[PDB]
Design an enzyme around this catalytic site. Structure first.
Site, short mmCIF file in Angstrom:
data_model
loop_
_atom_site.label_atom_id
_atom_site.label_comp_id
_atom_site.label_asym_id
_atom_site.label_seq_id
_atom_site.Cartn_x
_atom_site.Cartn_y
_atom_site.Cartn_z
N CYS A 212 0.74 -1.25 0.09
CA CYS A 212 0.03 -0.01 -0.23
C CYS A 212 0.91 1.44 0.02
O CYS A 212 2.00 1.28 0.50
CB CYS A 212 -0.94 -0.10 1.17
SG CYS A 212 0.06 -0.11 2.72
N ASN A 215 0.18 6.78 3.36
CA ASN A 215 -0.51 7.79 3.42
C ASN A 215 -0.70 8.60 4.68
O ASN A 215 -0.20 8.11 5.74
CB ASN A 215 -1.99 7.58 2.79
CG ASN A 215 -2.50 6.42 3.44
OD1 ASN A 215 -2.95 5.42 2.69
ND2 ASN A 215 -2.46 6.13 4.91
N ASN A 218 -1.88 5.57 7.56
CA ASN A 218 -1.13 4.40 7.64
C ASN A 218 0.40 4.66 8.28
O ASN A 218 0.99 3.55 8.25
CB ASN A 218 -1.16 3.52 6.56
CG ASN A 218 -0.74 3.98 5.44
OD1 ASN A 218 0.07 4.98 5.21
ND2 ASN A 218 -1.09 3.51 4.08
N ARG A 241 6.76 0.97 1.47
CA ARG A 241 7.44 2.25 2.07
C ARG A 241 7.75 1.83 3.45
O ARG A 241 7.10 1.29 4.54
CB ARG A 241 6.43 3.28 2.08
CG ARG A 241 6.45 4.11 0.74
CD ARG A 241 7.69 4.58 0.55
NE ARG A 241 7.67 5.47 -0.45
CZ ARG A 241 8.26 4.73 -1.72
NH1 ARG A 241 8.41 3.67 -1.67
NH2 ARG A 241 8.06 5.46 -3.02
N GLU A 270 16.29 6.07 4.93
CA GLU A 270 17.20 5.67 3.70
C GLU A 270 18.10 6.96 3.39
O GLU A 270 17.83 8.11 3.56
CB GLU A 270 16.40 5.40 2.30
CG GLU A 270 15.67 4.00 2.43
CD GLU A 270 14.56 3.79 1.65
OE1 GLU A 270 14.89 4.27 0.49
OE2 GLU A 270 13.70 3.04 1.69
N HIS A 290 16.53 -0.81 -1.92
CA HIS A 290 15.48 0.12 -2.49
C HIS A 290 15.64 -0.18 -4.04
O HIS A 290 15.58 0.73 -4.73
CB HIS A 290 15.43 1.37 -2.13
CG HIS A 290 14.03 1.81 -2.28
ND1 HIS A 290 13.63 3.07 -1.90
CD2 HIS A 290 13.09 1.69 -3.41
CE1 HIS A 290 12.37 3.23 -2.19
NE2 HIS A 290 11.93 2.55 -3.25
N1 LIG Z 1 10.23 -0.86 -3.54
C1 LIG Z 1 9.98 -0.39 -4.45
O1 LIG Z 1 10.87 -0.06 -5.28
C2 LIG Z 1 8.50 -0.04 -4.98
C3 LIG Z 1 8.19 -0.42 -6.28
C4 LIG Z 1 6.86 -0.05 -6.43
C5 LIG Z 1 5.90 0.68 -5.55
N2 LIG Z 1 6.40 1.14 -4.32
C6 LIG Z 1 5.66 0.97 -3.20
O2 LIG Z 1 4.22 0.48 -3.51
C7 LIG Z 1 3.25 1.23 -3.62
C8 LIG Z 1 2.46 1.37 -4.96
O3 LIG Z 1 1.57 0.11 -5.26
P1 LIG Z 1 0.73 -0.10 -6.59
O4 LIG Z 1 0.81 -1.57 -5.87
O5 LIG Z 1 1.98 0.29 -7.51
O6 LIG Z 1 -0.26 1.08 -5.86
P2 LIG Z 1 -1.59 1.27 -6.14
O7 LIG Z 1 -1.32 0.72 -7.32
O8 LIG Z 1 -1.41 2.78 -5.43
O9 LIG Z 1 -1.85 0.20 -4.78
C9 LIG Z 1 -1.71 0.56 -3.45
C10 LIG Z 1 -2.90 -0.02 -2.90
O10 LIG Z 1 -2.95 0.44 -1.37
C11 LIG Z 1 -4.16 0.43 -0.97
N3 LIG Z 1 -4.08 1.05 0.61
C12 LIG Z 1 -3.97 2.45 0.87
N4 LIG Z 1 -3.85 2.41 2.29
C13 LIG Z 1 -3.96 0.97 2.72
C14 LIG Z 1 -4.20 0.74 4.03
N5 LIG Z 1 -4.20 1.51 5.18
N6 LIG Z 1 -4.44 -0.78 4.16
C15 LIG Z 1 -4.58 -1.65 3.11
N7 LIG Z 1 -4.39 -1.06 1.90
C16 LIG Z 1 -4.27 0.24 1.58
C17 LIG Z 1 -4.86 1.36 -1.92
O11 LIG Z 1 -6.18 1.41 -1.81
C18 LIG Z 1 -4.51 0.67 -3.05
O12 LIG Z 1 -5.37 -0.27 -3.70
C19 LIG Z 1 3.97 2.73 -3.43
O13 LIG Z 1 2.89 3.73 -2.80
C20 LIG Z 1 5.14 2.67 -2.70
O14 LIG Z 1 5.00 2.50 -1.31
C21 LIG Z 1 7.78 0.75 -4.18
#
Ligand SMILES: NC(=O)c1ccc[n+]([C@@H]2O[C@H](COP(=O)([O-])OP(=O)(O)OC[C@H]3O[C@@H](n4cnc5c(N)ncnc54)[C@H](O)[C@@H]3O)[C@@H](O)[C@H]2O)c1
Ligand SMILES: NC(=O)c1ccc[n+]([C@@H]2O[C@H](COP(=O)([O-])OP(=O)(O)OC[C@H]3O[C@@H](n4cnc5c(N)ncnc54)[C@H](O)[C@@H]3O)[C@@H](O)[C@H]2O)c1
Lengths: 331, 331
Positions: A212, A215, A218, A241, A270, A290
């Site tokens: 997720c 935000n 959370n 995150r 980080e 990362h």
């Molecule tokens: N490590 C990395 O290199 C890397 C790679 C891709 C994405 N990111 C991480 O993954 C997230 C994006 O994912 P997607 O999967 O790309 O994102 P989306 O496609 O934005 O999915 C995130 C999901 O999280 C849900 N969510 C928000 N708050 C929540 C809570 N408290 N409990 C449960 N679900 C909740 C949303 O409703 C949404 O469906 C980014 O915000 C980031 O934190 C990091």
């Protein structure tokens, strides 16, 4: 002249040049902090491109006198105050899914590394550990478990979360998720179990994986309180995150044995380092710098995409010409 | 009295005792070589249970005067001369699939570790490498590739091979296999591409994974010759048998860069060690102490199964009462 666009926390613009050449003046700051940004940028910069190594607070944003758009070259945009930027008439955009699968694949790698102990067995083999007999194989590989029947609890069933769920099924994982923002019925479409509360998911999962965005609601989702709700000897994976987990709580839980192991690609502070932070000497901990998102194709893909967004913004209209604006409400 | 049954290369019989108590006299030799086996065993032992740390040549087998059955506590039985044992009226049995999935899961872990560089990124993070900027993430994670579209070439589409193929699809791998002993049409049932020759598979695969038993016809399947048939910068995974690969050829290929990386859970000379062998200082090499098969449930499962086979043999008739005899032809 052609509007000035600056790459804040980076110094390479080779991939973006071909796309911005005739419509903008490219420049880079290679800044490790907003204080490292030069005056000319704050005064004339119309557009800005940034990664995740730099944060932008309201104070930071107000220092720009012409900034009309900020494009995050990646998925997460928690490092940017989308709200303030919006009030300041600054549109914020991201790059949604250039690395969805790279991320799900790394997530699975971490999950399997905890269950099969591949990394630890290798690391021990480098430590000079000797494994000649079966008894020793069993000792050095102690903890490696049979995956089929294990419950993988996914938190956030978005792009990555869904890619993870699908891969997980093939290993015999019973998959269940929690995502309070999704409409009802998505669980039926993908044939997955959904739960209504975090405690619910945590309590029934043998392995918990975060997917997720970070935000206002959370921060430190995983607390000394919530950690207590997790199963005894459960695994924790986090490629989302760092701010979603209270490292102090995790560290403790890891030492006491409440959590059998954790795989973290992101951290509260980080650049991450084993020498400092609450995770120092924390047992059974696998980390990565990362890089869950990386693959040359994805890096190239997201950069040409960010570049095009800047172009649309400069040649068209804000926020009408943008494809991935994440703060329309505050505009 | 009750027939004597001996555990050759091991010293723990706790799991087998409950099953053999009233029908056999349990004993263990904890031998690291056949020369370490005591006279009383060679003279009176009716049954024998062994792992993979000890080899049995014709000479070895002829030294037993009452041995009627040898049960391998595991999958592979290349460490036993099934042919000679058969001529000597010695039935050889194994334990087919107590760890099929543990093995496929580790295999996938190795595959992903090469593609996502999880282990290497972690190992570097321990080396003190610093990764603060994006440029550095890209450098430290250099080589990590987008899996979708890659061709996984499986050699041996048996139990493990099939479990691997199925998991592989979920990651977007284009799967193709080679297995000259299977009947025609299995590829249609599982929706997979099959090729007729090894060179064929090797040439079209970005990642090659071994899943065939070691037999009289595939010793050093991967040679200086066949290695030349592999794609430039292809990955090699081996959780099958060390004898299938000529480490010398692999080492060279790894240094020259012809092979981007290899993950080995088995080696020609086990116990494996980085200090000795042709793999010394070989670039981009991840190893594991032959634990691909391990999980407490599988260890327990295969031992109770081996125990039951011994029991059937002692209480019933050879080879009629046996469930997993692998040398019926030589009996
Ligand atoms: N490590 C990395 O290199 C890397 C790679 C891709 C994405 N990111 C991480 O993954 C997230 C994006 O994912 P997607 O999967 O790309 O994102 P989306 O496609 O934005 O999915 C995130 C999901 O999280 C849900 N969510 C928000 N708050 C929540 C809570 N408290 N409990 C449960 N679900 C909740 C949303 O409703 C949404 O469906 C980014 O915000 C980031 O934190 C990091
Ligand atoms: N690392 C470990 O802990 C571990 C775990 C399980 C099995 N083993 C390895 O895997 C093998 C067993 O696999 P299964 O998958 O259990 O075995 P099966 O179920 O015996 O499958 C092996 C397949 O290999 C095929 N084969 C034989 N020679 C071949 C060749 N030259 N080219 C292509 N295919 C060939 C056979 O026809 C068969 O379909 C064992 O022999 C052993 O080498 C090791």
């Amino acid at each position: 002249p052609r509007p000035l666009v600056a790459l804040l926390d980076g110094r390479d613009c080779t991939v973006e040049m071909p796309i911005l050449k005739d419509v903008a003046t490219v420049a880079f700051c290679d800044a490790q902090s907003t204080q490292e940004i030069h005056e000319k940028v704050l005064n004339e910069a119309v557009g800005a491109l940034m990664y995740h190594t730099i944060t932008l607070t309201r104070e930071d944003l107000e220092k720009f006198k012409a900034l009309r758009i900020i494009v995050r070259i990646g998925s997460g945009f928690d490092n940017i105050d989308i709200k303030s930027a919006g009030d300041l008439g600054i549109a914020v955009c991201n790059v949604p899914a250039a690395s969805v699968e790279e991320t799900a694949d790394s997530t699975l790698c971490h999950i399997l590394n905890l269950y099969r102990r591949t990394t630890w067995l290798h690391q021990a083999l480098r430590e000079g550990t000797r494994v000649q007999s079966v008894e020793q194989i069993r000792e050095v590989a102690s903890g490696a478990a049979r995956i089929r029947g294990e419950t993988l609890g996914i938190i956030g069933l978005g792009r990555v979360g869904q890619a993870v769920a699908l891969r997980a099924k093939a290993f015999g994982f019973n998959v269940l998720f929690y995502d309070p923002y999704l409409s009802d019925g998505i669980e039926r479409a993908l044939g997955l179990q959904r739960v209504s509360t975090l405690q619910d998911l945590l309590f029934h999962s043998d392995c918990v994986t975060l997917h997720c965005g970070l935000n206002e609601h959370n921060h430190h989702l995983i607390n000394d309180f919530t950690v207590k709700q997790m199963r005894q000897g459960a695994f924790l994976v986090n490629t989302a995150r760092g701010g979603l987990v209270d490292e102090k709580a995790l560290a403790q839980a890891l030492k006491e044995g409440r959590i059998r192991g954790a795989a973290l690609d992101v951290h509260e502070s980080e650049p991450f380092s084993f020498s400092q932070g609450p995770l120092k000497d924390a047992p059974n901990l696998i980390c990565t710098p990362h890089a869950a998102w990386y693959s040359e194709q994805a890096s190239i893909e997201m950069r040409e995409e960010a570049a095009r967004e800047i172009r649309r913004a400069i040649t068209g209209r804000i926020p009408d010409s943008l494809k991935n604006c994440v703060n329309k409400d505050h505009l």
